[PDB]
Amino acid sequence: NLYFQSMIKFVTTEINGLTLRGTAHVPDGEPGQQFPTVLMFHGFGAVRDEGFRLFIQMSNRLMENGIAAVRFDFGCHGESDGEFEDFTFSQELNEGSALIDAVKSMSFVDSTKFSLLGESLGSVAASIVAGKRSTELTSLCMWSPAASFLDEILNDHTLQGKTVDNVEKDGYFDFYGLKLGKAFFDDLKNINIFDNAKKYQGPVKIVYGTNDFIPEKYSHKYMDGYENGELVIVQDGDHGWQSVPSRKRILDETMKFFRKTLLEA
Amino acid sequence: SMIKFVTTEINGLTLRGTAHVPDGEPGQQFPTVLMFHGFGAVRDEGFRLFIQMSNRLMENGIAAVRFDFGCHGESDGEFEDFTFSQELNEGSALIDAVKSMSFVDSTKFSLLGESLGSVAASIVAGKRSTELTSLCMWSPAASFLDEILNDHTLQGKTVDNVEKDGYFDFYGLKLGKAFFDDLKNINIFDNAKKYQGPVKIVYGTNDFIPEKYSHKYMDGYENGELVIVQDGDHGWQSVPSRKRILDETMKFFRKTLLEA
């Protein structure tokens, strides 16, 4: 009889002087109950909803099945503090690690049943944070990892197909009307995706859609380094799961994974 | 200043929003801009657009409030159940709900729209004209009835398979038959022309919406201003056009909410 209904509430935390703003979906439960929890990392220049309600749908699916879902705007993204011109991926990694501690400190979170979910660059961040905080995560799920982003910018000299070679001349990179700064580009040399990601030995699921513009080889590279990886290739899935059939599939595959790793273990 | 999260219930749906409240004395109220996002968008709008506008207003003493419409973003409701009529109902109800908020000066209250949100704002303003100090519309998607009903496309994709498939696929969201059946109920320009307050429309020359729709609005506004931004696009998705849209809009709301 002890019972409260599910709730969608807004949460904040402070990391390195920035207020990060987020949404928590807490399942139905009893007072004092703690829930297995999935912390979601959005992609580059994205927001915590992700594209076309993607993380919202995933959050509510988890909530309806007894798994709490938490998702923040990264620093310099969405409603969190920070100018895009100051964004660096190293800062995103620092924040992702700090968000594990912040979210585990929330009273409704079962710290022993805590996982990461990523989309696009958020999957890359999740893979690196998982390697550096390996004992903190029950499992790791990565959608459409944008693990080519260093190769693309540093070797192909483009960012989502647009040249990066005018940054010094113009003073910035124009990302859909946001000003991306020199600091982002100068920091890229510091990132090592796969050497760090392979340190995580827990259950990993990667979901890759055959229409993803990221080459499939990057998902296979992850798998080479994972002791307990599963790679699901979704026929006609795309990078953001932007068809009704592939959206249903990504929600199902992910709920299946977190049921197995968080609810049945 | 402070960024607060607000909710209101309309027709059984909880709408979820963000309020940017300026710094002030305890008990102070502020002129307020209520922002309407576009079709299948969220209350941030694309690439931080509404967030940037909200903080610009907040820093200048104007409170900014922006909700996810029903069936959008974090608000309740499935996209398959979305209709424009219920967006118009929610937009009207949001005027009353936001005016009832503690920090909102109900006498200095305006609407801002982007894309379909501008169309909704134009209709609600025409129908609730005494409630609004001013109206600003970015990139109004006022061709949307013509495109769907006459050209049988929705952002370039056919709508002629909806009956057979049971839905329209909008970037992985199921849009339902209810949306299309409801389009016959919608009148843009005869509603919009009723509003006599100051209106500003900002239109970018790279907008895929034909410029003629903004001129049609102007023909019906007694106090309209049309700004054409060279090389601006529908979502203000270049750094120069983003600076321009924020500046033009701050200027308009300074004039209409801070200096009137």
Author numbering:
A (entry chain A): -5 to 259
B (entry chain B): 0 to 259
Question: What's written in the study?
Answer:
Here, we report the crystal structure and biochemical characterization of a feruloyl esterase (LbFAE) from Lentilactobacillus buchneri, a LAB strain that has been used as a silage additive. The protein forms a homodimer with two-fold symmetry where the active sites from the two monomers are oriented facing each other. The two subunits associate to restrict access to the active site such that only single FA chains attached to arabinoxylan can be accommodated, an arrangement that excludes access to FA cross-links between arabinoxylan chains.
Wild-type crystals grew as either triclinic (P1) or tetragonal (P43212) crystals under identical crystallization conditions, whereas crystals of the S114A variant were isomorphous with the P43212 crystal form despite being produced under different conditions. Several LbFAE crystals were screened, and one dataset of the wild type was used for initial phase determination. In subunit A, two lid loops (residues 142–148 and 158–164) rearrange to flip FA toward the entrance of the active site.
